[PDB]
Write a protein that holds these residues in place. Structure first.
Motif, PDB file in Angstrom:
ATOM      1  N   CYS A  98       0.826  -1.224   0.000  1.00 47.28           N
ATOM      2  CA  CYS A  98       0.000   0.000   0.000  1.00 47.28           C
ATOM      3  C   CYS A  98       0.849   1.258   0.000  1.00 47.28           C
ATOM      4  O   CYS A  98       0.523   2.243   0.663  1.00 47.28           O
ATOM      5  CB  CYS A  98      -1.021   0.000   1.138  1.00 47.28           C
ATOM      6  N   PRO A 104      -5.640  -1.325  -0.051  1.00 46.06           N
ATOM      7  CA  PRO A 104      -5.193  -2.710  -0.296  1.00 46.06           C
ATOM      8  C   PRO A 104      -5.907  -3.374  -1.473  1.00 46.06           C
ATOM      9  O   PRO A 104      -7.057  -3.055  -1.743  1.00 46.06           O
ATOM     10  CB  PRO A 104      -5.480  -3.428   1.030  1.00 46.06           C
ATOM     11  N   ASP A 229      -3.236 -12.230   4.338  1.00 49.14           N
ATOM     12  CA  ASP A 229      -3.211 -10.776   4.489  1.00 49.14           C
ATOM     13  C   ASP A 229      -4.489 -10.284   5.171  1.00 49.14           C
ATOM     14  O   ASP A 229      -5.595 -10.446   4.651  1.00 49.14           O
ATOM     15  CB  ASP A 229      -3.043 -10.093   3.117  1.00 49.14           C
ATOM     16  N   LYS A 230      -4.337  -9.721   6.358  1.00 46.03           N
ATOM     17  CA  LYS A 230      -5.446  -9.185   7.152  1.00 46.03           C
ATOM     18  C   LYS A 230      -6.031  -7.907   6.534  1.00 46.03           C
ATOM     19  O   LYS A 230      -7.110  -7.470   6.942  1.00 46.03           O
ATOM     20  CB  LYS A 230      -5.040  -9.012   8.635  1.00 46.03           C
ATOM     21  N   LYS A 231      -5.389  -7.374   5.476  1.00 38.87           N
ATOM     22  CA  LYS A 231      -5.875  -6.180   4.771  1.00 38.87           C
ATOM     23  C   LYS A 231      -6.872  -6.510   3.636  1.00 38.87           C
ATOM     24  O   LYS A 231      -7.030  -5.737   2.686  1.00 38.87           O
ATOM     25  CB  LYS A 231      -4.705  -5.319   4.258  1.00 38.87           C
ATOM     26  N   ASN A 233     -11.001  -8.119   2.913  1.00 38.55           N
ATOM     27  CA  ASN A 233     -12.265  -8.442   3.590  1.00 38.55           C
ATOM     28  C   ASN A 233     -13.045  -9.551   2.839  1.00 38.55           C
ATOM     29  O   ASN A 233     -13.981 -10.145   3.396  1.00 38.55           O
ATOM     30  CB  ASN A 233     -13.127  -7.187   3.802  1.00 38.55           C
TER      31      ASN A 233
END
Ligand SMILES: NC(=O)C[C@H]1CCc2sc3ncnc(O[C@H]4CC[C@H](N5CCOCC5)CC4)c3c21
Length: 272
Positions: A98, A104, A229-231, A233
């Protein structure tokens, strides 16, 4: 053919090669392995001017002349300078991190980028060319976020000089062995960067090398879910596990145990 460009014809376009960031008002973007990439203009058409090694300049032109594809960058001309169609969304590496506040990439976007990159490698291999430097910094993104492979300056035979990024290189590549199978290994590392959003190497991280996570997952210490990747959804276990399975297969230490790029494409296609 590529237009016969002179150094003068390409110095002005870059505002006398202005080495300042665009976010502040300049012409320098960043570096590209063997040079600096500057933003340019050839009649209200944005270009990427790569100011740089002579043999590597010659090799890009030879490969670019023979290879035209949806998933490879386009060479417009040359003069040392190389001129390309400008990729507005920079590199996959920059987008995964980013850089400069870009949002993201979604899982949906990441799957399309992974597919595109594989079509790019498949085209190169179908034309009997080994890339030798597959990495997220060399996967650029257009206006529609289409993956476009770049840097053909280095494109089973042994070599005296080992070249490429060590964090992405196949075991045999580090031993001087040139094989299309090395490109598969390097692509496996890129898939790990897509899933995790992590760079292949970080000197301020445990583990420092991303491909070390494959062994934490394999030796049941962790799962692929602990590294997603927690970025994002929109990711789902099924497609994430499917892309990890491809990366795992690509990252075999024995080159003959790795899939060919055609089987890789097929598997990424099945994934969606
Ligand atoms: N393989 C390459 O070196 C890409 C070159 C060759 C072919 C083309 S076509 C093109 N279009 C746009 N940019 C481009 O390279 C930017 C280079 C600097 C990057 N930076 C990293 C540090 O942070 C800032 C960004 C972002 C991408 C390019 C490139």
């Amino acid at each position: 053919r590529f237009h016969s460009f002179s150094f003068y014809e390409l110095k002005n376009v870059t505002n006398n090669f202005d080495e300042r960031p665009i976010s502040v008002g300049g012409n320098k973007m960043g570096e590209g392995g063997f040079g600096v990439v500057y933003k340019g203009y050839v009649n209200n058409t944005t270009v990427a001017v790569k100011k740089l090694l002579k043999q590597q300049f010659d090799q890009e032109i030879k490969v670019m002349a023979k290879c035209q594809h949806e998933n490879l960058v386009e060479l417009l001309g040359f003069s040392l300078c190389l001129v390309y169609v400008y990729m507005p969304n920079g590199s996959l590496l920059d987008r995964l991190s980013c850089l400069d506040g870009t949002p993201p990439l979604s899982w949906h976007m990441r799957c399309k980028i992974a597919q595109g990159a594989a079509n790019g490698i498949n085209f190169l291999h179908e034309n009997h060319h080994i890339h030798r430097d597959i990495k997220s910094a060399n996967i650029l993104l257009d206006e529609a976020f289409t993956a476009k492979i770049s840097d053909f300056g280095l494109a089973t035979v042994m070599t005296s000089r080992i070249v490429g990024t060590t964090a992405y290189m196949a075991p045999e590549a580090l031993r001087g062995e040139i094989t299309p199978k090395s490109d598969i290994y390097s692509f496996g590392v890129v898939l790990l960067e897509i899933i995790t959003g992590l760079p292949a190497v970080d000197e301020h991280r445990e583990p420092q090398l991303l491909l070390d996570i494959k062994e934490e997952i394999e030796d049941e210490e962790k799962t692929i879910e602990d590294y997603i990747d927690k970025k994002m959804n929109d990711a789902d276990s099924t497609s994430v596990e499917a892309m990890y399975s491809v990366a795992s297969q690509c990252l075999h230490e024995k080159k003959n145990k790795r899939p060919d790029i055609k089987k890789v494409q097929q598997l990424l296609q099945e994934m969606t």
